[PDB]
Every structure is written in C-alpha cells, then in structure tokens.
A paper describes a structure:
D,L-Propargylglycine (PAG) has been widely used as a selective inhibitor to investigate the biological functions of cystathionine γ-lyase (CSE), which catalyzes the formation of reactive sulfur species (RSS). CSE produces H2S during the metabolism of cysteine, and also generates cysteine persulfide (CysSSH) from cystine as a substrate. However, PAG also inhibits other PLP (pyridoxal-5′-phosphate)-dependent enzymes such as methionine γ-lyase (MGL) and L-alanine transaminase (ALT), so highly selective CSE inhibitors are still required. Here, we performed high-throughput screening (HTS) of a large chemical library and identified oxamic hydrazide 1 as a potent inhibitor of CSE (IC50 = 13 ± 1 μM (mean ± S.E.)) with high selectivity over other PLP-dependent enzymes and RSS-generating enzymes.
We then determined the high-resolution (1.9 Å) X-ray crystal structure of the rCSE complex with 1, and found that the hydrazide group of 1 forms a Schiff base linkage with the aldehyde group of PLP in the active site of rCSE, affording PLP-1. Moreover, several amino acid residues of rCSE (Glu339, Ser340, Arg375 and Asn161) around the CSE active site form hydrogen bonds with oxygen atoms of 1 in PLP-1. These results are consistent with the observed strong binding of 1 to rCSE in the SPR measurement. The optimized cis form showed a dihedral angle defined by N–C–C–N of the dicarbonyl structure of PLP-1 of around 40 degrees, while the energy minimum of the trans form was located near the dihedral angle of 180 degrees. These results indicate that PLP-1 can take both cis and trans conformations, though the cis-form of PLP-1 appears to be preferred in the crystal structure as judged from B-factor analysis. In this context, it is noteworthy that the substrate pocket of rCSE is relatively small in our X-ray crystal structure. In the pocket of rCSE, PLP occupies 181 Å3, while the size of 1 is 71 Å3. In addition, PLP is located at a position that restricts entry to the pocket, and it is estimated that the space through which molecules can enter is only about 70 Å3. Thus, the covalent bond formation between 1 and PLP seems likely to contribute to the high selectivity and potent inhibitory activity of 1 toward CSE, in addition to the multiple hydrogen bonding interactions between the inhibitor and the amino acid residues at the active site of CSE. We also confirmed that all amino acid residues of rCSE involved in the recognition of 1 are conserved in hCSE.
Residue numbers in the entry:
A (entry chain A), B (entry chain D), C (entry chain C), D (entry chain B): 10 to 399
Write the structure that this text describes.
Amino acid sequence: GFLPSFQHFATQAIHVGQEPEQWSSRAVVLPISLATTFKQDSPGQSSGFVYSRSGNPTRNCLEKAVAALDGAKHCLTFASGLAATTTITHLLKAGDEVICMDEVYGGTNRYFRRVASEFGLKISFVDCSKTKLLEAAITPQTKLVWIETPTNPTLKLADIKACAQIVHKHKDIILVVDNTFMSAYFQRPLALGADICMCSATKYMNGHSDVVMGLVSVNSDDLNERLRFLQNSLGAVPSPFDCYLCCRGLKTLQIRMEKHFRNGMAVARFLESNPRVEKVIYPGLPSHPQHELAKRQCTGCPGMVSFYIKGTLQHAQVFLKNIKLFALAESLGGYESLAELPAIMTHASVPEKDRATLGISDTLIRLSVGLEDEKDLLEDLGQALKAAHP
Amino acid sequence: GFLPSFQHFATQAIHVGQEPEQWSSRAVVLPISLATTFKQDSPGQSSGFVYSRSGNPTRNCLEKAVAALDGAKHCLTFASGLAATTTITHLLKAGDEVICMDEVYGGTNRYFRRVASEFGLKISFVDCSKTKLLEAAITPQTKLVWIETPTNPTLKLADIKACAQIVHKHKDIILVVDNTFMSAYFQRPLALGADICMCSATKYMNGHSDVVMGLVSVNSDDLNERLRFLQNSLGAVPSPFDCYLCCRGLKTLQIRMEKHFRNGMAVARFLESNPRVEKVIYPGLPSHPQHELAKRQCTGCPGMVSFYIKGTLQHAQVFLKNIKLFALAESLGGYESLAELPAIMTHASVPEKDRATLGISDTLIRLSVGLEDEKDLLEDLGQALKAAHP
Amino acid sequence: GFLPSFQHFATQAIHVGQEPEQWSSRAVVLPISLATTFKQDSPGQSSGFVYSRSGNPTRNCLEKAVAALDGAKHCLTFASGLAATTTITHLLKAGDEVICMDEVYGGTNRYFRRVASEFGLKISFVDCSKTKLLEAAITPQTKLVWIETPTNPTLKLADIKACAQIVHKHKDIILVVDNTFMSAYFQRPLALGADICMCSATKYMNGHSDVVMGLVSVNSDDLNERLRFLQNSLGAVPSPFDCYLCCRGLKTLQIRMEKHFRNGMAVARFLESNPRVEKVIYPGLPSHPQHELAKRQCTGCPGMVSFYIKGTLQHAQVFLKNIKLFALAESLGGYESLAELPAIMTHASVPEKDRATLGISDTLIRLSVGLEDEKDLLEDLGQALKAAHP
Amino acid sequence: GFLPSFQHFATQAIHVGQEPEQWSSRAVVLPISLATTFKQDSPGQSSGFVYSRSGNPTRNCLEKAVAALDGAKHCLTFASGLAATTTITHLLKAGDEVICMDEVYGGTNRYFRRVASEFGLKISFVDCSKTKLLEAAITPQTKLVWIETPTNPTLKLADIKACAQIVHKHKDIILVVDNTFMSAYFQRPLALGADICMCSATKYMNGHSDVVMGLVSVNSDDLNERLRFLQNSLGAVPSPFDCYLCCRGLKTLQIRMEKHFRNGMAVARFLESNPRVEKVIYPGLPSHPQHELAKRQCTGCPGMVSFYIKGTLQHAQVFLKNIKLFALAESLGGYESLAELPAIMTHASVPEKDRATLGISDTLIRLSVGLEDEKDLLEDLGQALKAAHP
Ligand SMILES: Cc1ncc(COP(=O)(O)O)c(/C=N/NC(=O)C(N)=O)c1O
Ligand SMILES: Cc1ncc(COP(=O)(O)O)c(/C=N/NC(=O)C(N)=O)c1O
Ligand SMILES: Cc1ncc(COP(=O)(O)O)c(/C=N/NC(=O)C(N)=O)c1O
Ligand SMILES: Cc1ncc(COP(=O)(O)O)c(/C=N/NC(=O)C(N)=O)c1O
C-alpha cells in the first residue's frame, strides 16, 4: 500500500552524467581524477575546470547522478553529512532563527545547540510530527526549518507536505528534509514541497560503510548559487576517490534498498511477536503510530528497526554482547547488519532529560538490518534475546 | 645564511606514528582503512575507534607524523585549507574580532570578508609586516590574529616572533600562522610563538597535486580540545585515502623542498638579470626587502617566485601562452612547474582597488617552480619572455 | 524449475573472512593494505605476512570469501582471467595434452593455440557438449580438460557432472570449469565434480566494470599446494586495491545476479517475439536446445543473451550504431548494459573458418544485460532493431 | 668518478606522456581510469581503447614515462617483477636454452630451475662476471641470457657492454639485464647493448613500498610486438591504481636515488671501519672488487649495502633483533631502511650447497638504506652491532 516505485530510478542511477563520450578514452566507467589543478587555455577562462575544491570531473559526475535520483535540478557533495548541515546553516546570518525537529541525530543536535547557537543563530527544537507546534514556533526571524523523517533513532515521522504548506505561508523560510534514513529510493522530499533534500551519503546512498559524505539537492537556482558559493568558500569538499566509491554504490541502490525492505520487515515482524521485546518501531508495521502517513509519503521502508528490550539497561547490554551476526557498532545503511544503544552511543551528547522526553531510554536498541539471509538474521536476534531473558 | 636545518626531520617524516607493531599484519606501510565504523566490545567503550568522522587509523597516523614535523603536540586534518580556516574561525563566537594579514589567498579574503563577517564576527585587514599597525588594530574584542608569511601572491613577510610578542601581551588572543608557502621543512611557526600552525597540505606537504587537504598543529591542550570538538562536530574531515596519499607525500618532503629551493633560487636569479622583467620577488634573493628577516625565521626558501613582467597585461598573456614546461594553472607546491596571473585567477574575487593597494597588478605573475632540471626551466622562461618582448 | 538457490550465500558473501576481530582497529570493513613487506619478529619466522606477492591481508581476506561462495576449501586470485588460465596451464609439463571446449573466449583460444602449444603442450579443441567426443579425445597423455559452460559467445552448455565422470575414469586428469558466464551464485562446478572452478572476476563477481581479476577455487590440498607455488613463482598477482573493490562487489553479488536474471529473461523473451531477430540464444528460454540441462545444473541464468539479427553484417552494424542505453563495448557482467559483435571484436583472433564452424557469424550479437529498468532496456532494443529493419 | 648523470631525467620523469591536452578536463595529473571497457564508434575500430587488459589510459601513460627514463622506444608493465620474468621467458619455445647469472634473486632462481625447465627450456647458471664462462656456455640452442647486475644479494657486477658483445656475435640471442638494484637513474642497460631492460618496479622505481610491479623496456620493434602479444595473452597486467602510484613515485626518482647514494655510501664507510663487521660489499667503495667497472657503467650507486657480521648466525640474529630504525623485513628500494638475512629469508629456496658456492652464508646481512637522516642510521647500526658484540 506504499506510493508506487520510481520507474526509471535504476536506469538514471546507472546512466545520468555517465556518458562515455565526455572522456577522451570513452571509458564506460567514470575515471577518478585526483588532479588539484587543470591547464587553462588563457588566464581566467570561464569554461572548463580550474581548481579541484571549486569543481572536478569525478565530483561533478556524482552530483549529476544524485540530482536525478533526488528529482532535483542541482546537487552539491560535502565531506560528511555534518559538513552538509554546517554548509546549509551558513545560508543564514546573525539574527536568524532555526526550528529543528526535536529528535535528530545526536551530532545534529550538538551542532545546532553548542556551535551554530554561538554565532547569532537562535535554535528551537520542536516536535514537527505535530503541525500545530511547528505553526506556533514560527516567528518573523525564522529562516530555516530542519526536519528528519523518520527520526534517528525512534523513527518518528513528520508529514513533509503538511510541514511545507505551513512554512511556505511565510516569506523566505527554507524547509530542509534530512532524507538519510529513507534514501532517495523510498522518499523524495523535493516532490513533497521541501526546498532542500539533504542526506548523510555515509549510510544507504553509498551503502558499503567505506565513505563519509554529505549530499544536498535543490531545485531553486537561488539556493544552488548560495550553496555553491559555500561549497567553494568553506571548502568542506569530498575526495574524488570518495565520489567514485559513492557513485559505485549508487549503481546498486535500487536492489540494495529492496533487500533492506524485505529483511527489515522480516526482522520487525519477528521482534513484534517475541515475548522478550517490550515494543518494536518500524514504519512498515501497521503497529507504527504513523504507518498510514508512511504509506502516503514513501514508496517503501528501509532496514532501520528500533525496539525496546524488556527489563533494564543490563538486558540491553547482554543482548548487544551476544549478537554474533549483527555487530555492535555505530552507523547504519551498510550491507552488514549493525546494532547500537543510542542513549550510550550516538545520542550520549543529548542531555539525559531530553533523551527521556524523546523516548531515547536505556532499553532502546537501534538495528540497521543489512543484506544477509533473512533466516540467519532472525536466528541471531532470537539467540541474543534468549541470552538476555532465558 | 638561513637558520640551521631541522636535524631529525627526514627520520621523523618516515617513522613517527608508522610503527609496524600497531598493525595485526606488521605492515611496514600504513593501511588505508576506509571503514566508517568499528566493532565495540561493549556499548560506548571509551577506548578504540568508534566512527570514521571522529577518528580513524589512517587519519590518526597522518596526524601523528604532521605533529612531529610541525614541532607540535597535536595535529588535526581537514578536507581543505579553507575547511581548516573555517574550523579555526569556529573557535570564536558572535561579538569577537579577527585581524587578518591584508594580503592573503583570495579564498581566505572571501571567507572572512563575505562569510565569517555575517555571523557576528568583525574582520579587519592589517599590514602585519608593520608590527605597529598590528599593535594599533588590537581591541579588547580581538580574539584571533591570522597571518600568512610569506603572503600569497606577493611574498611579503611578517616577523612571527615580533607579532607573537605583541598579541601575547593581551589576554586570550590566538595567533594563527598559515605556513602553506614555506612548508614545515623551512618554517616552524610554533617554535616562533604562534598558537596555531595551519597549512593547505594541497601544496608542498602532499607535493603531488593529487590531494586537497588542510592541517592544523597546536601545542595547547585547550586549543586541541576545542579544535577536536569542531573537527568532529562540523565534520569537514579528509578521506582516509587522501590521508594515505598525503602521508606518502611527507616521506619525500625534505628532498622535495631542498630541490624546490635549488630550482627556485636559480629561476629567481635568472629573472632578476633578464631585461624583460620589471621586478622579481623571492625571499632568498638579497634584493627582497625582507631578505634579512627570511634568514632569521626560516631554514631556507621554497619554489614560489613572483615577478612583474615589463609592459602590460598583453605581455603577461603572451608569456603565459608561450610557456611549454611551466603550465598555466592554479595551485602550487607540486613536482610540476606552474604559472598564474593572480589578478585574473586566484585573486579575481579581491576588489580591484584592494588588488591595486596590495600590488596585485595585471603584470604580476606567480610561479611555482617544480622539480624539473634547472636548465630546462630557465630555457622555458627565456623563450616565453622573448615571445612577449622580442 | 532451476535447482534451489544457495541458502546462506548472501550471509557468507558479507561475513566469511571479514571478522572485525582480525584488525587492530576492529574495522567492520577490511582495510586496503598496500604494504609490499611486513616486519618479522625473527628471520624467516613461519607465521604472519612476509612479502605482498606471496600473500597479503586484503588478498587473503578476498580469497576466504570467494572460497565460501564457490563451495571450495581454497581460492587463489590472479591479475586477470587469462593470468588464472596461464597459471593453471603451468600445473602441467612438456609432453602433456590439454582438451579445450571448442568454443571459448577468443583470448583463451589464442593462449592455448598460439602460446601454450609452443612449450611442449598438445592442445585439442573438442565439442564437449557431446560427451562421446570428449571420451574419444582422451589419451594417456591427457592431463587437463578445460570447459566453459555456457560458452562465450554462443551460450552452448556442457554437462559438468557427465564430463567429470568421463575424465575421472582416467588417472590424473584435472577438469577445469570456467564459471565466468554463470557466476558462483548460479552454478557451482566443484559440487558437480570439477577439480578447479576458474572465473574472470572482471565480469559478474566484481560486477562494476572497474577490476580485471582471475579467481581459481579448489578442494584438493595437492592442487592448492601446486597452484599456490605458481601464484608466488609466476607472480601474476592482483593489486590489494583491486582485491578490495572485488570484495566490495561480492557484497551485492546475490541481489545483482537476481536482477540480471529478471532483466536477461525479459530481453530474451522480447527478442524471441521480434520479427527483426533471426534466432535468440538464452539458456533460461525453453527454446534453448539445452534448456533442460541448464535447469539440472544451475540455480538460474544471468544477463548474457546472444541473438542473430535478420539480414547481414550491415544490419548488425546499424543496430550497434543506434543502441542508446546498451553501449557498443567489450566485456560483460557489469551493472551497465553492453553489446558487441564477437566475429569482429572478442573473437576476431579466432580463424574465420573456425568462427564459421562454431556459429560466430557476422550477424551474431552478444548482449550483457545490466541492472537498468526492464522497460528502458526493451524500448532501446526495439528502436535499434527498427533502425536496422524499418 | 662515475659516468656523468642523465641531464634531462627529472624533466622527463615529470612531463613525458603527461601532457594535460590528452584529458578532456586538462588535468595536470593523470587520471586513474579503472574502466575495464570503452565505448567504440563502430565494431572493431582500430583506434582508441578496447579492453583494460589490452591497454588503458593510466597504464599507457606510465609506459611512456618509463620508456623515456630507460632510454627506450617501448615499455611494458606487469603485475610483478616475476610476472615480467615469466612473460620474457614466453618469448622462447620448447628446445631453447637460457643462460642465467649464477647469483640472482631467489624467486628468479626458483622460476627458471623449478618451472621454466619443465616446459622444454634448458637453464644453465653461469658466473657472467667472468666473460669467458659466458662465451663457453653459449650453444646454437641459446636464445636468452639473463643477467642481474649488481646481483641480489652479494652485489657482484657483470660488464654489460662486454656480455652484449659476446652474445651479439651469435644469431638471435636476447640479452636481458635486470636493472632492479641500480634503477634507471644510475644504470641504462639499453645504452650498453642489452636487448631488454627489466626491473621489479616494486623496489626503487616506485620507491614507496606500496606497489608490486614489473617493467620491461626495449628498442626493438620485433621484441616490442612479441612482448605486447604476451602482455595481452598471458594477462599478467598491473592495476591502473598501481600504475598511478608507480607514476607518482617516478616524479621523485631522481632526488630519492641521490639521497639513497649519499646514505648508502655513509653506511658502507661506517661498516667498513667497524671492528664487529667481517667484510662490507658496496659497489661505491674502492674496496669492492669491481669498483672500477661500477664507475665505467653506472652514474652512481644506490642504497643496497651487504655485509658479513663477525661470528655466527647467533650474532646476525642479535643484530637483526636490536635494530630500531632499520626494520627486519623483505624487500628493498623503499624510503624506509630495511634489513634481511638472505640465507633464511629471500634465498631460502636456493639449495644450501648453491648458497655456499655463492657466498650466501648465515652471517650475510643485506641492508636497503632508506631516506632517513644519515646520523640516525649510523647510530642505529652502531648500537645494534654493539648488542651483537659487546
Ligand atoms: C539522520 C542523520 N543525519 C546526519 C548525520 C551525519 O552524517 P555524517 O556522519 O555523514 O557526518 C547522521 C549520522 N548518523 N550516524 C549515526 O546515527 C551513527 N554514527 O550511528 C544521521 O543519522
Ligand atoms: C596560503 C593559502 N592558504 C590557504 C589556502 C586554501 O587551501 P585549499 O585550497 O586547500 O582550500 C591556499 C590556497 N591557495 N591556492 C592557490 O593559491 C591556488 N588555487 O593557486 C593558500 O594559498
Ligand atoms: C569465459 C571467459 N573466461 C576468461 C576470460 C579472460 O578474463 P580476463 O579478461 O579477466 O583476462 C574471459 C574474458 N572475456 N572477455 C570478453 O568476452 C570481452 N572482453 O568482451 C571470458 O569471457
Ligand atoms: C633483482 C630482482 N629481480 C626481480 C625480483 C622479483 O620482483 P617482484 O618481487 O616484483 O616479483 C626481485 C625481488 N626481490 N625481492 C627481494 O629481494 C625481497 N623480497 O626482499 C629482485 O630483487
């Protein structure tokens, strides 16, 4: 019952920006161009490449592919998801206000709360799953609304089209959607009214746990010009080698995301029927409080499954010590299954009282379900839960 | 007559941080670890690696080597020299003031003037080659003094020890020296009183025109803690692949820099006796106005030579069209000889009236003398100057 | 109606040999170790790494993963499929005889016919699709039988179990199956009686058209010892960087091969009903003469589809000029759709009279169907065939 | 008193084959093109790239640079020095004879003695430092003479011009010189009458202990055609990534080799005056028995120094356990100083009686002197020798 799949996604992921005719060799795969500089025909010629930080063949090719997958006219790549977040925030100026989704990646929270707030920006954290709370938080000084959906790590949704309608009633507010948890294959925020589609390509977009990278996609020529200026001027740019590996990852994005959905749904159903589990959170389950919204704004669901184990922190620790296929590690969106305890790991920097309000408790486990055989994943979770609750 | 050479530099560049015992394999060369994440023995363990952006084996190994070469306790790597500049600026807060050397890389000028200044920072450009002008510009709100020496692109010097003495009479002012043009082999700002030694590793430190990277070295544990927080929280981090290539470049840094000095001095002497050249600028020539200061604060001089061609922009254009070994291109500090026209290329973003005051005229040519045979370089410059002025 | 799928394949492709505990860092992804050499605790210690050609961490990790996917105890990697072929041939000696499948890759034919035959080896080409012809060609001097199934490029099959039974009635004959066209996911020659499973990892195993590599898998400890001696002594070894990229490719092998099968079957059915096509060859179609054998010895079929266009070479040339999604290029098994004319390209070195006997005519087109959207692939073939035959 | 230095070597190492005009981007540094295949304008077009094993942009660019440095018209790259040796041996046929220098790398000995000899080739090991022994070993069946000079590991020389005159009195004998120990910077066998200049680029040519590679340089169009056929048909080809790193290494070859000579000469003089050393071998010392020949056929000497420690294997082991800057490890020609015991390590495969005849005793230590500070290297050797002989 999800939105129908993007129909040319796999074709675009393989071909857009990848014409062999652009290379002297007619290579069918884009070259890795490491050169920092490029010979000019005359001083300050306005065409061709000039300096790697400003633009380079491998990065420019990746940006064309990602733009197509995000349904965007323009894409910019960065050294990390947090570097993308920093660059977007530099669109503003002293005196501006940001509204941020109350539950975000701990590093996003840390950046807004401890860094951006020291340079004349006012930050408010608001539960944007309730559109009336977003409506009430907007002031004439609001210039940016930052929403993750689903949220890291409790997988709360925001209605992107409903939030876009609220913010676009006001003059000059940018809506950013952090699309990291869904990927371009399952959610397209620019088609739902977002002004900026941002993600940590570190996760599903690259998909191989071997690249740290941020991606920012826009339709606005004004936002493109302002962001291009900052990509060049702050210089938080990715290695061309990383651009190559991320481009290589995109070639399998459609088939990886379909497998993450099959495995994720099987894990979520398994946990929901296991008596050692207090509560499962997966947007693809009917039990998710926003399951109907997920079907209205997504084409499917990835491999992110969160659950509350029965008991206390001690039981969560025993579960995470006994997993043998899932690895206790940070990150998500790789081919390999990962598990973490957000309260002690990714969200340790979020104040304890804020974690309590958000439901980031000492029994919340976040799973990133990989591409392994379903039966092997369910046997691993089963035996680890039995070790925690004999 | 320069300061005596650093005596263990080549040994440290090859061995510091490179112990084979730290690798399971006992590899004599550091591995490239691309992994974004690392398996933990228990949740939030305080030791080992956690997440690539926060720290990773290849980057941490490079940072240990660069720290030793800069005479520093601590080193941080960034996605670019401009990302290093952005990260250092985030040490401050709204209401603080920066004093910047009046002549800097065009991108540094653009960042301070057009970006940092919009986030509650006051920026003043001061000729820090005159220590009384630096003294007079300091206010109680000054928190950062940013000096390049020699300057890009007219190779003006600042007396680092004299500037350090002035800023350290006040409470809580950070002195940054951008050491890009000298390299760690020829100038050690932390030994002359700088608080931060910054460079674009894109240039001499890597030396192979195939890595964009920034390096920041400090002795202060307070500055290390604040900068480490921002490396992690802004996420302007380098690829581990780029860290490997930069580490590979450091292994030849001493012998490259000695050859840049031999070739640079030969080019400067050749241009100084050529009647088609109005004026040569090279800190190693007795004709440089600050030659005596260069000998007091450096162990030598690299391959950066600037000159004013006789005549007009038309003659500069004909010279740059006729060079056949030197390539018309941005960047510097590579094995390959490069030439540019800063007024139209690297410094085009600096307002025309500011270029005029700084001496960045339409006849100023910046050379980066590479590692080619001296006779081939002198014949190339000779025939190109003859094409401009028969 | 194919053999049932390998059930732990995806789990093994992700986990076998990839334990984080083997790395000092506990990296969840294998490091790229470029080091040529490794520090020894004492001279000629028998444990640990010694010299990259003899063995190295990245290559040894890939070999463990491939061995599991081939159902093998041992795997050896080489610089190319042809280097694997050369190394296997060096198992023999002057006076030995090789029987080779009559239709093989042009380069395999060239190696046996023009190179191996000059070093005291007698080569006979035999149609091993007819087991009585194999039986009749074996002499007391036969030491190696080399079979490709399906064959490059007309996709003829050999009954591996039936050929194994024939050769194993004799003393000391090695049966090699070149598994390049099926991949480890769809065919397991070691489980059907082959002594050696060889492939060009250049094709499906890597799957991203960015690595040239050969793989050889065995169960015999004797063959492992003899081949390991030759991997080290001929030195036709892969780069650790290439081993990393091939390992990265294996992580998606199961889901890529399932998509190649869906797309390949759709293309084959489309060509079979198109009146501009003389004849389609696809082992998954009931029309293939050996369709029933394919179902008895394989778990599916990949994306290799061959067809004879109606008319002459001129029509084949017009088809190959008008394809806009398929690219005219050598190779196969990549994510991108490729087309070639074997008589003029891959099999040009095979004598014209031998091409005629094998059915490698000037109207035979070989397609490698990639991972693009099925509808886009069928529209591209349709419009190109219409350009050839209005 | 050595031959005068090659005068354009550094210019050629940086520029030959590296024209920015050949790249669409005008990159000043060659791109890494990993593509296995290349789009053709029509089937079997005779120009452009076709298939990575047959030729590719990065490898072809490296081959142009190495050809210039070897004074050759043609260069071919291979997966290793041993793969280059295997490929050259495939120039022959059953019934041909090879004469090999009696002292060679252990792996070269193993290949000729245990592998090539099984394919109808007769191998004779001859002390080619005595030209009358070479003259007497030649028969009408001799087709190849293989000489290393200086030899691995006792640094015996052969007079290349005198050996060339002897073999070229006969019809159709190829003289190969393995130039690994000298590098192209110090010895040019093609200018002294060799038909083939071969080396392990694993050592000095790459110089960074991170690439395994073989290089073969020729002037003959006949040898080029025959070797090109075998590079393509045996497929023992290097990764384009390895070709890039080797090309990057060549940019510093001149300055690295000059430093290896300064450090190597200082180490040799230090060992020659140390009472814990029985005998030092270094071609640059007047004490070397062939010092006068070294000055007639080389432009200098690299960092390879061999010595016999006083006493027994126990003293050699204590020396190799106490070195703290030199590392006990195989290989040579890197920036890092290495030491090995050839009798137990590189030459363990050579029969014990052959080692005795050649002087490869249990007290022979081979040093590869790196690019560290001279004083640090002499202090390390001094303290390690004192640990062995208090
Ligand atoms: C929704 C979302 N947005 C941005 C980022 C930052 O991206 P980067 O790390 O590329 O700077 C992340 C990182 N999450 N990492 C984790 O949750 C973990 N480390 O496990 C995120 O989850
Ligand atoms: C003194 C100095 N500091 C910092 C940077 C920025 O470093 P990055 O480019 O790594 O962000 C540069 C760049 N110079 N580039 C040139 O002058 C050219 N592009 O020719 C610089 O010269
Ligand atoms: C069945 C089979 N076995 C071995 C090889 C050699 O492998 P390598 O090229 O890695 O040395 C190939 C190459 N085929 N390439 C093509 O058909 C093309 N070039 O289109 C093959 O098809
Ligand atoms: C003179 C000479 N020629 C060829 C090779 C083989 O090259 P490759 O290793 O690239 O196949 C070597 C290797 N020597 N390695 C050593 O001496 C060591 N392993 O210490 C050699 O020394």
